[PDB]
Design a protein around this motif. Structure first.
Motif, PDB file in Angstrom:
ATOM      1  N   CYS A  61      -6.859   4.455   3.323  1.00 35.40           N
ATOM      2  CA  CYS A  61      -6.440   3.335   4.177  1.00 35.40           C
ATOM      3  C   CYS A  61      -4.940   3.104   4.178  1.00 35.40           C
ATOM      4  CB  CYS A  61      -7.116   2.041   3.725  1.00 35.40           C
ATOM      5  SG  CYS A  61      -8.895   2.181   3.499  1.00 35.40           S
ATOM      6  N   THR A  62      -4.309   3.338   3.030  1.00 34.08           N
ATOM      7  CA  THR A  62      -2.881   3.072   2.854  1.00 34.08           C
ATOM      8  C   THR A  62      -1.980   3.930   3.747  1.00 34.08           C
ATOM      9  OG1 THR A  62      -2.813   4.604   0.958  1.00 34.08           O
ATOM     10  CG2 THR A  62      -3.132   2.255   0.483  1.00 34.08           C
ATOM     11  N   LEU A 118      -2.428  -5.946   4.901  1.00 38.79           N
ATOM     12  CA  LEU A 118      -3.161  -5.137   5.872  1.00 38.79           C
ATOM     13  C   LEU A 118      -2.717  -5.441   7.303  1.00 38.79           C
ATOM     14  CD1 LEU A 118      -6.711  -5.303   4.235  1.00 38.79           C
ATOM     15  CD2 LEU A 118      -5.162  -3.355   4.200  1.00 38.79           C
ATOM     16  N   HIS A 162      -1.749   1.397   6.517  1.00 41.66           N
ATOM     17  CA  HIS A 162      -1.560   0.011   6.098  1.00 41.66           C
ATOM     18  C   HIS A 162      -0.624  -0.161   4.921  1.00 41.66           C
ATOM     19  CE1 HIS A 162      -4.468  -2.004   8.645  1.00 41.66           C
ATOM     20  NE2 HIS A 162      -5.285  -0.983   8.461  1.00 41.66           N
ATOM     21  N   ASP A 163       0.108  -1.278   4.935  1.00 44.87           N
ATOM     22  CA  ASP A 163       0.830  -1.766   3.766  1.00 44.87           C
ATOM     23  C   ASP A 163      -0.228  -2.207   2.763  1.00 44.87           C
ATOM     24  OD1 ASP A 163       2.029  -3.767   1.921  1.00 44.87           O
ATOM     25  OD2 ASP A 163       3.834  -3.532   3.158  1.00 44.87           O
ATOM     26  N   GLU A 164      -0.127  -1.688   1.542  1.00 48.56           N
ATOM     27  CA  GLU A 164      -1.165  -1.869   0.528  1.00 48.56           C
ATOM     28  C   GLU A 164      -1.352  -3.340   0.178  1.00 48.56           C
ATOM     29  OE1 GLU A 164      -0.479   0.345  -3.089  1.00 48.56           O
ATOM     30  OE2 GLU A 164      -2.616   0.487  -3.572  1.00 48.56           O
ATOM     31  N   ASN A 165      -0.261  -4.099   0.208  1.00 51.36           N
ATOM     32  CA  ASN A 165      -0.314  -5.530  -0.061  1.00 51.36           C
ATOM     33  C   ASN A 165      -0.707  -6.322   1.182  1.00 51.36           C
ATOM     34  OD1 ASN A 165       2.547  -5.318  -2.352  1.00 51.36           O
ATOM     35  ND2 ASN A 165       0.345  -5.198  -2.814  1.00 51.36           N
TER      36      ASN A 165
END
Ligand code: BCB
Ligand code: BCB
Ligand code: BCB
Ligand code: BCB
Ligand code: BPB
Ligand code: BPB
Ligand code: MQ7
Ligand code: HEC
Ligand code: HEC
Ligand code: HEC
Ligand code: HEC
Ligand code: FE2
Lengths: 273, 323, 243, 332
Positions: free
Chosen positions: D87-88, D96, D91-94
């Motif tokens: 997913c990362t 979404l 997306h920005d891990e912190n």
């Protein structure tokens, strides 16, 4: 009825089988057993086209076509209407050709000359076998053969060729096509050379065998020789199918892709890729 | 079973012969040598070869055209000698891609092509003059030259007459192995399947005929070699058993026959027409016909077949389909 | 408007197509097929104006030939049918009939461009030889179809115009006479010469030349004819059916 | 040098015309194993719940799906596009909802593109349909793309030689040959016919005789055009892994009716479909892509027939996920 020098050659003998029964002439034509078998297999193939030709939609000789069966019939008997006539015709065609071929052996033996012609005539009959029997057997169906129509058998050739994207790239074909051009090229040389020595012009004297040889030495730096060019022709001529055949029979059984891509064996060698 | 017709069993060697022309006896160059192995399937004597002005001209223009082609090939692969040897078949010097009518195209797009062809055309012409002159000089007929001219005229037709008649150099044949082959598909497709041009048909049936005729004729001369049937001049002017046994072989098979002279008139003709029909076909193409298949469909010739898969309408006709 | 169309439903292409067919069949029927009728015509048991050939070494000859003499053919009708074959009366080989037949060629010697005799033996041709590598048959024993030794090669006869070996001369044992054979009947080995075309007994009756060191056109046929005649007349089995 | 028998053949024309496919069984199979890797559909999930346009912060395309169904699209997408990276990758891990990473904005526009193919192009894609997998096959950059010039290899998961490399000018024709099924047809049919709609594929006249005013001089289409149409078809042929009789009767390439097969019309809609993705959906993504992804003229990678078909007449042999993932179209 006879040529001014012909009576002295009309002697009994040469017949492969039949003996005296079939060994005779009707008009200028020689008969023999094979001359009868040819007549049988011609008439049987001619009468069975004509049947098929009536059941068709047209009688315009260019359009007419008596095609083979669908791929689902495999190597089995196909309905008379739906390909069966085509199969019937094949057998009669091959029957006459072989009979036309063998006959010429009888004619050859009586005159006491070589069997070179009927032995040169097998090379066509073989290429006819490559298309209507050996390749269909190698692909599984009689429905891969060419249809018997004057303009239609072309349409087969076109679709056959385009099935491998660009048939000119075929290396067997390249071979075959080159021998056709060179044999056509070779004949006008030989015809022309023989004519140009015997028919010089005006009140000029006929010339000799040394004149022939001098011409091609002068022009191209080399002269093959009387007897040889005739061996060269038969070879040049023969190899139009002898090599071609290999280009046909591989397309499908031994090669499924396009023919240009075949030349990737050259192209894709690692150390110049 | 005559093994002489297969190959020359014993080989005679002697002093070289020289048929003096009316001129250019001083233009024969070189010492003749003898290949033993050639001498089994042909005549051992290689050379000498006649020079003359026309001969050197057919080399100086022929080379020049070749030097122009190879240079533009080398260009194509940025002058990399290994990628020349590798890709050679695929390389080519092309006619113009852009439509310029007949106006001389730029060097970068078809200019070097048109110039490569001029020097080819001059070379072809120079040789012809040699093929004609060497005939006359030795007191021979001009039969060879005129056939050669017909084949020259087919190159001229497909080279520069047909582009002229339609008015576009783009129509010309490229130089190169695969490229001048690729032209054969482009040309045909653009003018509607050459399988539907009658003069292709004539062309094929004469070329096919040449196959049969030389095959048959070769077979007949070898077949009668035992009676010195190869000696074809002196069989014409004093008929021997050789060509008696020939003519009869055919007359009993196919019902009629030729003479030893006339059968060489059948071949000469059949070769000639291959190029004449081929030339005729082309001269018609693009000037007076555009799609040979629809020319055959109009004149009710082209054959017709039923549908295996369902008839497929041209989606460019459906309401609201894009361009 | 179209390029190439004309009045009615007719276009340029349509008209040249007829022209093409008419020139073709014109040429075939009205030329090539008349040039085919210069030899053997008129028929026996649409002709052209005769053609003369002016010969390289003097004279002329209009063809077809009419000979002042008609040769007697020792043959005999099989059946009363129009096209019935003919069976030999006498010994067919020496008579020269069927495949043993010869053409009535001129009794003149074939001639090199400069004038000399074309076909001559190597004993005459001092400037000719056999190329190193090929077999010299001079002195090998020639052996027939029956497997009997029929003589010994004694010379070769080169064609000086083309530099091509055309004949083989052999002394017939018992007869004290030489006899020519064409190389086309000779399987040339290292140690012998095989001639399946005629039996040992028959070599004695090969046509005799008129002169020892030269051979006329008619003599080249006669001799050549003989051996070809043997292929069907050597034994009585060679004339019947194979199977 | 060759391929051993038997050979698989079919019939696309009237018996005796020699129209049909010729397939090597051991290639047919090799293709199936590859395309069988297609991940199966994730089991259908709870219909009820609020729309994700309410639930989530930044959802401009998949609003109308309930969170459970929304996240199932987000797993599936990651399976098809970037499974190895998860997913990362987008997306920005912190955060979404953040559009920090460029594969997010690109995915949004892709997401629209995929819905457009299945809704506005069923004349080609039928009920089979296209997903993220048809082109990507488990990787962010698809195996078969196309720049404004030829490039080797055609599959961008295999390491190119120095001559195969686009900087190296010597390999140019060989790059051009392998796109045209190894031909020496001196033309680039993608950049001519598929990268936009400025060119016309048909060259054959549709009348026996030449029409006055267009059949002489500068009024004519040069012969080159014929070459180029053939170039494109050799590539279509090679792209799908078939031959010309699968869509034409060679008798008459120009004619429809009995002389073409239903596949050809379907082929026709492919051309308009590939044109409509390259101009309106793929080429403009050069503003959203880093330069490591662009060509030597700044162009974004675009698709050809091969992008989806990869050597087979139907992509993944008619594999469908149309009903399982309806959120990807066809949209009412
Ligand atoms: C409409 C017809 C086209 C056509 C269609 C065509 C096809 C379909 C095919 C070819 C092919 C070929 N064409 Mg091509 N063609 C060629 C030349 C060629 C060759 C590269 C090749 C073989 C043909 C052949 O063997 O001919 C006959 C050769 C002759 C008469 C010369 C024989 C020379 C002999 C072998 C010399 C031997 C002596 C030794 C060198 C001595 C050695 C001594 C040592 C010390 C030339 C030079 C031209 C012109 C006019 O410039 C031309 C025009 C055309 N061709 C037309 C545009 N051509 C074939 C190929 O493979 O190329 C792709 C092929 O398959
Ligand atoms: C899709 C492909 C098609 C096609 C396209 C095509 C075209 C466009 C043309 C032909 C032509 C021809 N096609 Mg054909 N074709 C042919 C056969 C033929 C020939 C009989 C005929 C004449 C070409 C020729 O002989 O050139 C060989 C001889 C040549 C080219 C002359 C060269 C002689 C020259 C004096 C020598 C020069 C050599 C120099 C030494 C070289 C020096 C060069 C240097 C300076 C660079 C067959 C047998 C088939 C079969 C069985 O399928 C077939 C299918 C096709 N053809 C398809 C339908 N064909 C020609 C024709 O007849 O027009 C209607 C033609 O123009
Ligand atoms: C897409 C179309 C392509 C194509 C597709 C093609 C295919 C699929 C095949 C060929 C083949 C061949 N192509 Mg072709 N081709 C050719 C030339 C040739 C031939 C040399 C060669 C052999 C033909 C054959 O086997 O006849 C066969 C003819 C026979 C066997 C005659 C049989 C005679 C029979 C024994 C007697 C019949 C007697 C009558 C019933 C008697 C009538 C009685 C009356 C007269 C009283 C040329 C010169 C060209 C040019 C110039 O472009 C060309 C282009 C193309 N070919 C296109 C690129 N070609 C063949 C080949 O060799 O492939 C490698 C072949 O299989
Ligand atoms: C890949 C190879 C194929 C091929 C590709 C091909 C092409 C590309 C072209 C032809 C053409 C032709 N082909 Mg064809 N072909 C033909 C016969 C023919 C002729 C109708 C025609 C002229 C050729 C010619 O003059 O030859 C030389 C022999 C001569 C000149 C002697 C005279 C023979 C006479 C013209 C033949 C007439 C045959 C009739 C149909 C009658 C059949 C017997 C009836 C009475 C029972 C036969 C009989 C066969 C057999 C039995 O196999 C055959 C096989 C093939 N051809 C292969 C399947 N052929 C040309 C055409 O225009 O067709 C419309 C043509 O362009
Ligand atoms: C039915 C009609 C047929 C036909 C007929 C006839 N065809 C004839 C005659 C007739 C009657 C002759 O009078 C003449 C000849 O002499 O007979 C042996 C000739 C010819 N048919 C040749 C080639 C041919 N025929 C083809 C086709 C058909 N022909 C068709 C089928 C094809 C095909 C198919 O492609 C080819 C390739 C040449 C050998 C010759 C021309 C020489 C020339 O014009 O050379 C000129 C060019 C040169 C001299 C250049 C040489 C290059 C040097 C080495 C450069 C040095 C390089 C250096 C290293 C640079 C640095
Ligand atoms: C390189 C080798 C070459 C070569 C060689 C030689 N060629 C020879 C000899 C040699 C040595 C002879 O001894 C013999 C002969 O006598 O000399 C005139 C012969 C012959 N070459 C003929 C046709 C010919 N050569 C072709 C090609 C080459 N020849 C190649 C180029 C082509 C092409 C290319 O199409 C054709 C059409 C006939 C005239 C004749 C046999 C007739 C027969 O056997 O009599 C008996 C048969 C009939 C009278 C008719 C049979 C009807 C059948 C039963 C039913 C028809 C079925 C058929 C399938 C329908 C198809 C039609 C459709 C395509 C529309
Ligand atoms: C009436 C009846 C039922 C009789 C029964 C007996 C019987 C079985 C008869 C056969 C019936 C049949 C089917 C006959 C058909 C005869 C055929 C095969 C006809 C087709 C003939 C065709 C079209 C041939 C095409 C080839 C062609 C252009 C030939 C014309 C040029 C000729 C005649 C070449 C032959 C020929 C060659 C090739 C030489 O080299 C040669 C060298 C030296 C001297 C002469 C010659 C010579 O005549
Ligand atoms: C690129 C290929 C993506 C991958 C891999 C994943 N997601 Fe995604 N995400 C992507 C887009 C284009 C969008 C906006 C969708 C739209 O219709 O406009 C999203 C959004 C989300 C959200 C909502 C965030 C918010 O608005 O607050 C969530 C919660 C989300 N995505 C989750 C998610 C998960 C869990 C993933 C892996 C399992 C995943 N995404 C992969 C693009 C991409
Ligand atoms: C072919 C018809 C495609 C389908 C179906 C989908 N995508 Fe795609 N993708 C395609 C191209 C031509 C490109 C440009 C090349 C490139 O990779 O830059 C892409 C790219 C992406 C990316 C960016 C990858 C990267 O550059 O790092 C993403 C994140 C992406 N695609 C996602 C994506 C999604 C979510 C899809 C379904 C909804 C989808 N793609 C389908 C071609 C095609
Ligand atoms: C279906 C998958 C096809 C195959 C296989 C081949 N072609 Fe084709 N062809 C196809 C289409 C959809 C079109 C029309 C495209 C358009 O937008 O107009 C064509 C057209 C041609 C043409 C031009 C016809 C005309 O109207 O003038 C030619 C000359 C042509 N195709 C040739 C050709 C060749 C040589 C092929 C094999 C290499 C081939 N086609 C395969 C669809 C398909
Ligand atoms: C993915 C985005 C595709 C691209 C790009 C092209 N095609 Fe396609 N094609 C695609 C699918 C999902 C299907 C299945 C629909 C179906 O008919 O079952 C197809 C189908 C075809 C077919 C028909 C095959 C058959 O019926 O057996 C053809 C002839 C075809 N496609 C041709 C084609 C061409 C020529 C394309 C480029 C110009 C092309 N397609 C692009 C998906 C995709
Ligand atoms: Fe001859």
């Amino acid at each position: 009825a006879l040529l001014s020098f012909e009576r002295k050659y009309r002697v009994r003998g040469g017949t492969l089988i039949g003996g005296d029964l079939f060994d005779f002439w009707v008009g200028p034509y020689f008969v023999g057993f094979f001359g009868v078998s040819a007549i049988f297999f011609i008439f049987l193939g001619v009468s069975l086209i004509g049947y098929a030709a009536s059941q068709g939609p047209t009688w315009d000789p260019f359009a007419i076509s008596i095609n083979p069966p669908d791929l689902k019939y495999g190597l089995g008997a196909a309905p008379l209407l739906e390909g069966g006539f085509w199969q019937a015709i094949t057998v009669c065609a091959l029957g006459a050709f072989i009979s036309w071929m063998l006959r010429e052996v009888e004619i050859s033996r009586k005159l006491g000359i070589g069997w070179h012609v009927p032995l040169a005539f097998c090379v066509p009959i073989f290429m006819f076998c490559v298309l209507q029997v050996f390749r269909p057997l190698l692909l599984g169906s009689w429905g891969h053969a060419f249809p018997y129509g004057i303009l239609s058998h072309l349409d087969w050739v076109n679709n056959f060729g385009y099935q491998y994207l660009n048939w000119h790239y075929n290396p067997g074909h390249m071979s075959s096509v080159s021998f056709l051009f060179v044999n056509a090229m070779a004949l006008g040389l030989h015809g022309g050379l023989i004519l140009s020595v015997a028919n010089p012009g005006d009140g000029d004297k006929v010339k000799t065998a040394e004149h022939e040889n001098q011409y091609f030495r002068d022009v191209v730096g080399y002269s093959i020789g009387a007897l040889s060019i005739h061996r060269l022709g038969l070879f040049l001529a023969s190899n139009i199918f002898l090599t071609g055949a290999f280009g046909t029979i591989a397309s499908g059984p031994f090669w499924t892709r396009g023919w240009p891509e075949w030349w990737g064996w050259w192209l894709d060698i690692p150390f110049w890729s | 079973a005559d093994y002489q017709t297969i190959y020359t069993q014993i080989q005679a060697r002697g002093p070289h012969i020289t048929v003096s022309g009316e001129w250019g006896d001083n233009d024969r160059v070189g010492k003749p040598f003898y290949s033993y192995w050639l001498g089994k399937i042909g005549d051992a004597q290689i050379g000498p070869i006649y020079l003359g002005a026309s001969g050197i001209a057919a080399f100086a223009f022929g080379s020049t055209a070749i030097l122009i082609i190879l240079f533009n090939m080398a260009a194509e692969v940025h002058f990399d000698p290994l990628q020349f040897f590798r890709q050679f078949f695929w390389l080519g010097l092309y006619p113009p891609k852009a439509q310029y009518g007949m106006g001389i195209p730029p060097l970068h797009d078809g200019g070097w092509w048109l110039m490569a062809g001029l020097f080819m055309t001059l070379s072809l012409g120079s040789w012809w003059i040699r093929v004609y002159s060497r005939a006359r000089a030795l007191g021979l007929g001009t039969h060879i030259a005129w056939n050669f001219a017909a084949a020259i005229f087919f190159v001229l037709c497909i080279g520069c007459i047909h582009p002229t008649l339609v008015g576009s150099w783009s129509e010309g044949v490229p130089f190169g192995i695969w490229p001048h082959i690729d032209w054969l598909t482009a040309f045909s497709i653009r003018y509607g399947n050459f399988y539907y041009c009658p003069w292709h048909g004539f062309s094929i049936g004469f070329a096919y005929g040449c196959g049969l005729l030389f095959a048959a004729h070769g077979a007949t001369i070898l077949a009668v070699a035992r009676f010195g049937g190869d000696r074809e001049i002196e069989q014409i002017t004093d008929r021997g058993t050789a060509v008696e046994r020939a003519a009869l072989f055919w007359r009993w098979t196919i019902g009629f026959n030729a003479t030893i002279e006339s059968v060489h008139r059948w071949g000469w003709f059949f070769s000639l027409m291959v190029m004449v029909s081929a030339s005729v076909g082309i001269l018609l193409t693009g000037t007076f016909v555009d799609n040979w298949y629809l020319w055959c469909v109009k004149h009710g010739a082209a054959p017709d077949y039923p549908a295996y898969l369902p008839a497929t309408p041209d989606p460019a006709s459906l309401p609201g389909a894009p361009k | 408007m179209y390029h190439g169309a004309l009045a009615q439903h007719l276009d340029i292409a349509q008209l040249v197509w007829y022209a093409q067919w008419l020139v073709i069949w014109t040429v075939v029927l009205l030329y090539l097929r008349r040039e085919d009728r210069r030899e053997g015509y008129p028929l026996v048991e649409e002709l052209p104006y005769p053609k003369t050939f002016v010969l390289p070494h003097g004279g002329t000859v209009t063809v077809p030939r009419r000979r002042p003499e008609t040769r007697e053919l020792k043959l005999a009708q099989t059946d009363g049918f129009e096209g019935a074959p003919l069976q030999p009366t006498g010994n067919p080989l020496v008579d020269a009939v069927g495949p043993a037949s010869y053409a009535e060629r001129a009794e003149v010697v074939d001639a090199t461009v400069d004038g000399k005799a074309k076909i001559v033996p190597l004993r005459v041709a001092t400037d000719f030889s056999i190329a190193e590598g090929d077999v010299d048959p001079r002195g090998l024993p020639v052996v027939a179809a029956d497997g009997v030794e029929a003589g010994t090669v004694t010379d070769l006869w080169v064609d000086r115009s083309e530099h091509y070996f055309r004949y083989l001369e052999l002394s017939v044992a018992g007869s004290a006479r030489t006899a020519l054979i064409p190389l086309g009947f000779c399987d040339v080995k290292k140690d012998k010469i095989v001639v399946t075309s005629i039996l040992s007994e028959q070599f004695a009756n090969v046509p005799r030349l008129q002169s020892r060191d030269q051979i006329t056109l008619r003599e080249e046929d006669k001799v050549s004819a003989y051996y070809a005649g043997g292929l069907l007349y050597a034994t009585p089995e060679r004339a019947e059916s194979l199977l | 040098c060759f391929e051993p028998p038997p050979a698989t053949t079919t019939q696309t024309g009237f018996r005796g015309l020699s129209m049909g496919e010729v397939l090597h069984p051991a290639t047919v199979k090799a293709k199936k194993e590859r395309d069988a890797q297609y991940p199966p559909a994730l089991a259908a999930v709870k219909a009820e719940g609020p729309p994700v346009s309410q639930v989530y912060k930044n959802v401009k395309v998949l609003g109308n799906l309930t969170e459970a169904e929304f996240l199932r699209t987000m797993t599936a997408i990651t399976e098809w596009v970037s499974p190895q990276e998860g997913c990362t990758y987008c997306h920005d891990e912190n955060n979404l909802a953040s559009e920090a990473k460029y594969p997010y904005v690109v995915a949004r526009r892709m997401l629209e593109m995929t819905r457009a193919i299945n809704t506005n192009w069923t004349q080609h894609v039928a009920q089979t349909g296209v997903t993220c997998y048809t082109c990507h096959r488990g990787t962010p950059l698809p195996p078969y793309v196309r720049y404004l010039e030829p490039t080797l290899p055609l599959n961008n998961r295999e390491t190119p030689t120095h001559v195969e490399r686009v900087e190296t000018r010597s390999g140019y024709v060989v790059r051009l040959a392998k796109y045209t099924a190894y031909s020496a047809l001196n033309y680039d049919p993608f950049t001519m016919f598929l990268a936009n709609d400025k060119r016309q594929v048909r060259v054959v006249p549709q009348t026996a005789l030449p029409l006055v005013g267009v059949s002489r001089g500068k009024e004519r289409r040069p012969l080159s055009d014929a070459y180029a149409t053939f170039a494109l078809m050799m590539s279509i042929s090679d792209s799908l892994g078939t031959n010309c009789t699968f869509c034409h009767n060679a008798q008459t390439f120009e004619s429809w009716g009995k002389k073409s097969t239903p596949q050809r019309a379907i082929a026709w809609w492919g051309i308009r479909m590939v044109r409509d993705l390259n101009m309106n959906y793929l080429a403009p993504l050069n503003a959203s892509l880093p330069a490591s992804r662009l060509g030597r003229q700044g162009e974004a990678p675009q698709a050809d027939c091969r992008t989806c078909h990869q050597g087979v007449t139907k992509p993944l042999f008619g594999a469908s996920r149309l009903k399982d993932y309806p959120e990807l179209g066809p949209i009412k």
